[PDB]
Structure 1
Amino acid sequence: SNKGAIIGLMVGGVVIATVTVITLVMLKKK
């Protein structure tokens, strides 16, 4: 359908993956 369609999920796929790492550290402040 579109080879570029995935190129847009690059920037949106890294951010959501970064916040997940920080979240784990948040609760670690226990």
Structure 2
Amino acid sequence: VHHQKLVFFAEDVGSNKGAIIGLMVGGVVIATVIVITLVMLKKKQY
């Protein structure tokens, strides 16, 4: 099975400062991705 992350550039519909609100609400999936990674990276030891 392949992927399709070409929709990642869809955020261009936004603008600038006001895009913070879009990136914040849409940032829920990116949060869990980076956060899950942070578990294994365990920042500053335990």
Alignment TM class, shorter chain as reference: 0.3 to 0.5
Structure 1 length as normaliser, TM-score? 0.34
How many pairs are equivalent?
A: 30
Counterparts of 2:43 and 2:18 in 1: how far apart (Å)? 40
Aligned-residue identity in percent: 97
Structure 2 length as normaliser, TM-score? 0.30
More RCO (CA 8 Å, sep 6+): 2
- Gap runs ≥5 in structure 2: 1-14
Give runs of ≥4 in structure 1 deviating > 3 Å: 1-12
- Gap runs ≥5 in structure 1: none
